[PDB]
Symmetry: C3
Subunit: 269 residues, 3 copies
């Protein structure tokens, strides 16, 4: 049943098994899918930065042809000349990656599965067990009533909340969330980091939120990612400038919104 | 093939088989899913009232992990502290229930399956056969050009129309409708009851419609449900008061709408 | 795996095998699904005209119960009296058809599969191989900045572009497109014909576009379809009259739109 959902790449698996043999602690796995709420593209930016900047290769491939609804989110063909020249498969993969140090870690990403989340969670549990994963770490942005002119708040959640140095709510499920819940029920350590992203900047990239999340992750896992922190820092500068001019040049109501949210923020702590 | 879609709870099945042994007529099954048009939440109110008020337990469990698209309708996790504390599975179940008398009946409900309706209908046919179901009964609200100030009309439909004491249309299918159609083709008695709900109150609870449907059901099946009829009656009083003040305090056009629909209604019969 | 997705009708298959025995060239297959962009209903009109006008029968039936999301596009039941009298199955079928000559060809149509496009493409490849298909031909409308007062442009694409007597883009995939891409990778000849349909008439029937596409198809395949060309020609006359009166009687901005698009059109070639 759940094992039918994925297959192993021997190269990636050999390299993992050699990391496991040389370090008894085991590996961290980061995971994040594209398809649920992710205010400010906080998780999406991090996924992009990892896969674009760091050396990696596949270790397990999920069967996206069974898991991904193609009419709902239509993968891109490329047209060149006259004919189809290429196709972006909507892959869902566990990759072996190295940080700037050369330290190995795992990274599970692609489109959020549309279906069969219980079987998918159970598959991810077998992968976590087979690859000696010691900690699984999810991350995303949630839109909040907070100002862009104050630092990004975060909500760490899961069983390893202690790694990031009153509340009872119902949240629409996502595949990562159910994966996290099933992993914890099986005894595995989970953390998650949700960035608090200002509602009114939520539907573009908010690099400050990706940066603040990347530094909680890096602080919690011991992974070292200075090039990515730097690129995000740079984007955040450009983005704060753009946001300032928008508010400054807009509506009275929008100005009054930011000041009203600043006041709420400063009055709390 | 269709048997893979569900499994039996032995406790619930034993209790059913003992009901079957003591009454040769067999049982009635009510069924209603969440996911198609149900003006006034007519079916939804009845589902809620049954499952909340009457003693019941599972007899068959469908494989919701195969049948329910999780990204389209995302089941709720609960967050408590710091971490996921619980999860509302999107279950699809045939339950044994007793009315206020202690008379047994079956109740099939949960999210409307998104996929595989032919295999699902055929599974429900095997369940209906194995559990000695004598009558299957669906129920929902359809939005109509009728006034809230006149009684709820109903359209009984199916092979047992006689149980509720000119027309040729194409209707978007729903899982219950295709189940009803396949059951009838296999010789099984089906009724359905559609409440006529005023368009302009259709997108909230319209307890009058649930009440009028509950009393056709109860009259057609011999089931006795006075506590539920009472709670619905009470809600309907509150709801008629709210609607009256809305129309009375709104637009000229809305007042003119209700009077125009009253006139149409009174001129017919 | 892919063979589970369809079954053969022996009658249709015998008649195909006899066509194959009498003509070594093999057959052409046209295919077009309902569910992706098709400006002006260009492909839809052709599908309708073929299936309504020409003698045909099933050769292969796909398992729509696995491939078609029923809640997303709900097949029609028919209500008559009092009860369900009929049901429009959302079939996906390869049909044997004859043109006005009696020349055989194949026609694959129904709702675009929602899921499992890789397995579906591979199934269509086995069907193309088993039925001696020499050319597979897709066709649809794309909305463009062009005037309704100038002829319909077309973009032929695929490996047999030569049959219809600078450009590098990413296009959302559709099932036909991925089928075309997999077929070409397996050595099979594909053509496609996309009609350029004026944006502002795109969301109804634009018979001129179906006609222009039908004549490229007919010219590329050697099929003869004069009755269908005639009906489309007739609709196009009615449609050009309706569009002229709309523009003529509308906004200054809409008049200025058509003239601005005419100017762009005439300045190119
Ligand atoms: Mg969907
Ligand atoms: Mg599916």
């Amino acid at each position: 049943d759940p094992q039918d959902l994925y297959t192993w790449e021997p190269k990636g698996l050999a390299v993992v098994d050699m990391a496991l043999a040389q370090e008894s602690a085991g590996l961290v796995m980061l995971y994040h899918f594209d398809g649920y709420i992710d205010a400010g593209e906080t998780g999406d930016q991090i996924v992009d930065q990892v896969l674009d900047s760091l050396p990696h290769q596949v270790v397990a491939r999920f069967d996206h042809d069974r898991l991904v609804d193609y009419r709902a989110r239509r993968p891109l063909l490329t047209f060149k000349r006259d004919t189809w020249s290429d196709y972006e498969e909507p892959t869902i993969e566990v990759r072996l990656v190295q940080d700037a140090t050369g330290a190995p870690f795992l990274f599970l990403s692609g489109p959020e599965p549309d279906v069969e989340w219980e079987r998918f969670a159970a598959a991810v549990g077998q992968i976590v067990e087979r690859l000696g994963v010691r900690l699984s770490v999810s991350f995303h942005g949630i839109p909040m009533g907070v100002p862009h002119t104050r630092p990004v708040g975060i909500t760490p959640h899961g069983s390893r909340t202690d790694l990031v140095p009153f509340e009872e709510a119902q949240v629409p499920g996502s595949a990562e969330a159910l994966v996290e819940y099933r992993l914890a029920q099986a005894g595995h350590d989970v953390l998650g980091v949700a960035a608090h992203v200002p509602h009114y900047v939520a539907r573009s990239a908010y690099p400050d939120a990706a940066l603040t999340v990347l530094e909680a992750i890096t602080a919690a896992t011991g992974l070292v990612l200075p090039g990515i922190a730097h690129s995000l820092r740079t984007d955040a500068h450009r983005t704060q400038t753009e946001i300032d001019r928008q508010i400054q040049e807009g509506d009275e109501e929008l100005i009054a919104l930011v000041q009203g949210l600043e006041h709420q923020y400063d009055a709390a702590a």
